[PDB]
From Swiss-Prot:
It holds the Pfam family SBP_bac_5. The complex is composed of two ATP-binding proteins (OppD and OppF), two transmembrane proteins (OppB and OppC) and a solute-binding protein (OppA). Isothermal titration calorimetric measurements of the binding of lysine-containing peptides of different lengths to OppA show that the dipeptide Lys-Lys is bound with 60-fold lower affinity than related tri- and tetrapeptides (Lys-Lys-Lys and Lys-Lys-Lys-Ala, respectively). PROSITE patterns: SBP_BACTERIAL_5 (PS01040). This is Periplasmic oligopeptide-binding protein OppA. Induction: Part of the opp operon, which is constitutively expressed. GO terms for biological process: peptide transport; protein transport. One of its GO terms (cellular component) is outer membrane-bounded periplasmic space.
Amino acid sequence: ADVPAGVQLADKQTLVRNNGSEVQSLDPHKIEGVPESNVSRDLFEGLLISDVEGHPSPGVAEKWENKDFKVWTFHLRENAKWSDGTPVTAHDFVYSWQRLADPNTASPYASYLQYGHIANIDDIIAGKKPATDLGVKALDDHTFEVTLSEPVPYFYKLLVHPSVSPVPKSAVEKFGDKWTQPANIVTNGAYKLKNWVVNERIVLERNPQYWDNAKTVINQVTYLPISSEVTDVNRYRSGEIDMTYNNMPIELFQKLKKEIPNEVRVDPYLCTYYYEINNQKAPFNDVRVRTALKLALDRDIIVNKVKNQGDLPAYSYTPPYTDGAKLVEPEWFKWSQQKRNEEAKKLLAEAGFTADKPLTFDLLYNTSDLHKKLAIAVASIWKKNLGVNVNLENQEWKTFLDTRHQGTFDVARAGWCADYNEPTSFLNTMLSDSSNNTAHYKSPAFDKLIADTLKVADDTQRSELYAKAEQQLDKDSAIVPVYYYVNARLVKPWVGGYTGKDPLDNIYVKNLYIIKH
């Protein structure tokens, strides 16, 4: 934390943040969501980290170079240490990236190493080469060298993500799936794990071995698993919670903006809310069915009338304000909703659906006041506009994500947030073989458009190909885009250090401080 000259600090430097739900795990190679990543950034530190405004900055690596955007050499700071006092070395990164790649780990983010094109990753994922063939090596204890199979100019932006953070080999090998319990875990970020009570709280305490420990101010941070956005706001206003999660309740938001304007933070955020269609399951494997759902949903009603929090109606997967996005707004987006509805109804009639034998399916969402209200509105809009019936189903966060990976669904509420600020952070998740592809979409045409992006050494050709990739996705109606999120949350006046300038919202509790109050 960089405490401004003249600010008086509170005597007790503790923070309470709501975190939306119970995390999937604390193992960096098994997590894939925002709640998970919020805790991960406080515990595990990769090569680079985001600064307080979101810019890629030195993490364990103090400096790095690249040769032709293909060989990247990271010089690790000599005082980086784990919480047990042992040094963080390049060997930890070799072991860690190999563990991520290894199919026995079954990481949902194994494909992150494909997104960065580390050498031999395809073969390793396929089981043709052992994980030790991965294109990473420790040149010495403090030098980690990564070899890619093609030039990737933005490669270093990828390194702030939890999947490429180090994990402690000795704890992993000795305790297996219990390595992350408090008595066994070993961490290298600014914090250490104090307590973990499922469905109650996660409590982290300052890690005195952290290399930048002298600049850490908060001594303890608690993460809560409250999925009700109304309850989160109530516990914030009662004084229990210092920072809500960044899902706001439809019930209270308009009132909050007029009641405590200086505490309602609303900033740009590179996330898209959509309905994820299971593309491999009939009748959702018919493009006419997907197109009808896409068109018949009324984004103006949802965005400006039911939610009205500042979100923008969406027509793509990649947010248009992503660095490198120059998207073409499809013609259907400029039509009236009435014209969209007619096209939608016509397509379902063509697909065989009638009043007597309508289209009825499930709409799965994770337990939430906001998602439930949105799903209710969507079900009503689809019923009225297209004659389709939906059965809403809620599941807790961890289970919900597992269901989407299983493909044991029809349509699911969804939100993808960038991992790095470049269009492939979204687009790579729709590749046929991506470990993140829970839409279960497989398009050779889409795949080829993306593969071609690193075969040009030109940004304009790259941007045009991303635009074309979004046009292929839209053509196939792989998803139902709803809105581009804004990052809206409540933050007490005494919480210093939160700029809201990072469109990825990669907060580190080591950067915050409690002002005397």
